[PDB]
Amino acid sequence: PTRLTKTRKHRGNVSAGKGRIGKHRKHPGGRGKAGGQHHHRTNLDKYHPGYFGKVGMRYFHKQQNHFWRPEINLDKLWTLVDSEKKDEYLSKSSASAAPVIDTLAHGYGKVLGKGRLPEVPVIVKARFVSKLAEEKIRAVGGVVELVA
Amino acid sequence: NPVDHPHGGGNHQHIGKASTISRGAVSGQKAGLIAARRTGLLRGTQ
Amino acid sequence: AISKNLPLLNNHFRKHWQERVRVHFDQAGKKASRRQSRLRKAAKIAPRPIDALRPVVRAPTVKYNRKVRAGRGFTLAELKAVGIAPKYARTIGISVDHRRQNKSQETFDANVARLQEYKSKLVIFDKKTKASEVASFEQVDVSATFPVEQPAPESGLRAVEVPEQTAYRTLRLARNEKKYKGIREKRAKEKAEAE
Amino acid sequence: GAYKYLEELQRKKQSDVMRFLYRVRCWEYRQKNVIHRASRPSRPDKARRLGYKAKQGFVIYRIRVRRGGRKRPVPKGATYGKPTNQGVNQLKYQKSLRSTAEERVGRRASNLRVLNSYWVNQDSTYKYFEVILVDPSHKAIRRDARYNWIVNPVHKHREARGLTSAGKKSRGINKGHLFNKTKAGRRHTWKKHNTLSLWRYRS
Amino acid sequence: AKSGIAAGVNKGRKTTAKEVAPKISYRKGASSQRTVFVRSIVKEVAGLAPYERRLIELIRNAGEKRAKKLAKKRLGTHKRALRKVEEMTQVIAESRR
Amino acid sequence: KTWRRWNVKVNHNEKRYATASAIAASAVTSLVLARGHRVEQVKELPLVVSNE
RNA sequence: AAGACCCUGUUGAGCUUGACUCUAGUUUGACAUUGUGAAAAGAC
RNA sequence: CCAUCGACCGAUCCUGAUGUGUUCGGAUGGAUUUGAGUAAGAGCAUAGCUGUUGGGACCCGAAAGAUGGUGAACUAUGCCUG
RNA sequence: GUGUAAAGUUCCUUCGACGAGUCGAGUUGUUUGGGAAUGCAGCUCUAAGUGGGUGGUAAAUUCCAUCUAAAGCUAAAUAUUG
RNA sequence: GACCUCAAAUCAGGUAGGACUACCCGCUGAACUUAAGCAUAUCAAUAAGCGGAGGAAAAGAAACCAACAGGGAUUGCCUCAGUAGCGGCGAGUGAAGCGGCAAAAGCUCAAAUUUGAAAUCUGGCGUCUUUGGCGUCCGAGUUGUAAUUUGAAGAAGGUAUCU
């Protein structure tokens, strides 16, 4: 609200906080990103390195849907098991009856290998998997099943 | 004055460039002796 | 005009943008009016449902394959499986799409099942129908009554079967095979015919 | 019928028979007024394809239009601006000669509606077109369920609004990625993309 | 059909294939006994275009490459040039008989 | 200008918090009196009346 | 009478030219408009 | 939370096992290199002061430039009639 | 109710016409986010019949996918300083 | 005496123009301004100028999007996204497919021998129960007016005898 602004406090003081010498003017230094290579180089080269120039190749008509592949790590994998049956599955899963985790159905494209799994066999269904993620799943007696 | 004519202006009255103008000059340039094969007093016969 | 450490902004306000400002002050009014329009439209044709029955289709785009949604209309082959002519289906509240095709079997079966459920719940009136029967039906909401259902993710328990080749290696080999498929067949062609 | 033969013959514009016919008809059309009434279509199959019927209330006009581009009509070539706008020659009109023919005929016969038009002939100076016209007031048209639609006032001078085939062509009214800018009207799409939409609970 | 995995050649999920009756709109390119008959009469009445006659004589002089380069110039694309030169050879293959 | 901000978003959970806090305050007689209500002849709050 | 002289401003304008960048006009060629013959030099 | 030596992931350089569409694969071990990374998450949302950029942009102020119109009752010049 | 009239469905056989100075190509100008050229327009060239268009890097060769131009009508959701 | 083409009439009956401005369909088209100068660029495919509508207009039932396990006329909102891209690659600029919703609606010709029958239509006259019906006479029309078909098909011959 306007009653909290310093405009109210500057009433009665000549320059409104803008100085007597500098004399707040319209656009000293230009408009927008003017002079980024000339008189604003000392700002851009310090706080925005990399600003000027071209790097890499162009990609005409990029469709972002081609690259949809959300990641899930191993340490978060068991959140996808039904919460009502998570405690039962941990104690009862074995090589004959292991939980099936459909990562794609939950919105994920690749399983990554960060963290530690429960020492419980799991059947993990995924479009993609990292090398370490599959080794850790196979080490707790589980398996990775590729889907499409 | 120079607005009025290609010959206008100067601190003396003078043309300042050749008054013989090419046949291929455009309107506003053709003042003087247009496409003159020669100039000056004719002496002898023709 | 460039100053202390701050993100570089892209504010596109260099045209006469104030001549083209649209403030939706009428959001609540349009909500109420759109609601009255639905009310009158339903009252006009009762007890026939307002909404035509719509099919269930997969969504395109590897980002949206997992999803299923309502499509535009049932295909000619799907209606043919139930025995309904395309021109007749439009008069009994069934949407028709001549553009969609049925390459696979799963969506075809799902929509044939939808058509059979709808046709089993359908009651057509005629001249022999008395107003007592007509007054006995309420205006059903077809979209809610026949909803689109996501097929469930696989859950539960199953035996663990471990192949000798890892899934990561399978992905790597599939990529390599695709990448060099064109040049390995060219090396093959130029070799068999010469030898 | 003969219409298929006429269709296939009219595609052979460089054969001796068609060259002879086009030469003589170009001379004949060039000897008459720039706009004149045609007693009948000179290409009856082409007229049929575009919606014409040999009924009372269907009218054919012929018109020639001058060929070439559009010289910018500024005095002595001065544009009074930046060099990017200094061009006078090699400029082009954004509507086609077909649309110009349709519009001039529509102005001459202001009691009629322009249905469609087609090319008939061509020389270095003129292109010749034939314009199909329909009389909204004629009872043969007002009683015809296949042509009643044009009586409605929303089709008043549809050729002046680019609503005919040639007009819709020049407006860029077509489907797909090649027509993103003009698909639903160029100016409409520009206005939509340059409107700041503010809701009550700004998000 | 599809391989069942997310990468490689013929990638994608497996579905049970269903036969599709081809749409009638997919026959657009096919010729009919109507058009073939009409077009052959019209070629008798009309004759040849001047560039086609220039192109017959190139083939007769055994200038195969010379005819293709003119046909591409006149028609616009290399694909249409290939069809036209082939057609104009068959015209010669019908004068000998 | 008309495109001033007129309406304000509030998180729905926080709005519900405020509703619950307001209902709880209605059972405290000191707050009801300081609010300015003439409730001095009511024995207890909440005041509940039969469904008739 | 917010110097008309002088200076400053990355403020102009009138005028000039072998300034930078263009332009109406004009000229030159090709193609189209554009058809029907003959003789003589050329090339497959 | 700080200083310091490591370890993990991506880029770069090197090494190069079992194997092969024999040119692919890339086990394994190294490198004063490199990243807006990891190493038991901290974010999202609303509001307020201050600061930033685009907007008439704290208020008033050019000389100019453009588009479309109105004037030869003054005056300049030709013409017609006195 | 002129219901030997009209229309609808399934199956078999033979067929199955489908828009040209247009498509397309070159060039010029303009325009577009459209980048060896997005649309539009002028001029030159000028088609075909499983052909034609499109598939966001120019070209030839081989496939594949997807529609069916150059003719036409049509409520609603959308706009609204009159 | 026909026909074709072209005229005339204060011929019988109609129709157009002009106005309004917020929104709508097109044509034409700047510069101030920003780039701390400036010419490409920007302002802007904007203002001014011109033509044409309606209660909405335009668009619209794929010569579409896609590359998926595929969607399925048009339009709008949210998002995509200040992104792919364009740009003295500077200042700046900048869409689309998908996804969620609002609303949902589909179709018509040309190209076909009715050929055992122009089956079609304007007008005049008479008449009536008059947004028109009936009868009749000219005219239009075979250089093609009706019925039949529009690619999702469909047609011509058979069909189960069914609705």
Ligand SMILES: CN[C@@H]1[C@@H](O)[C@@H](O[C@@H]2[C@@H](O)[C@H](O[C@H]3O[C@H]([C@@H](C)O)[C@@H](O)[C@H](O)[C@H]3N)[C@@H](N)C[C@H]2N)OC[C@]1(C)O
């Ligand atoms: C390959 N040689 C490595 C040498 O590169 C170095 O390893 C660095 C390591 O020090 C860097 O790590 C450095 O920077 C990271 C920061 C970037 O996250 C800090 O977290 C870390 O404390 C710091 N030491 C790490 N980012 C890359 C390794 N290659 O460590 C010594 C070494 C073994 O000789």
Ligand SMILES: CN[C@@H]1[C@@H](O)[C@@H](O[C@@H]2[C@@H](O)[C@H](O[C@H]3O[C@H]([C@@H](C)O)[C@@H](O)[C@H](O)[C@H]3N)[C@@H](N)C[C@H]2N)OC[C@]1(C)O
């Ligand atoms: C308790 N274990 C800790 C573990 O939590 C973690 O601690 C990090 C520590 O390494 C980080 O610190 C690290 O990275 C910072 C950074 C500014 O570059 C540097 O000081 C330096 O590279 C390094 N010490 C510190 N910034 C946060 C702690 N939680 O790092 C490993 C550890 C030291 O064993």
Ligand SMILES: [NH3+]CCC[NH2+]CCCC[NH2+]CCC[NH3+]
């Ligand atoms: N609204 C601006 C009208 C002028 N057009 C200029 C922009 C055109 C874009 N050119 C970019 C370079 C060509 N791809």
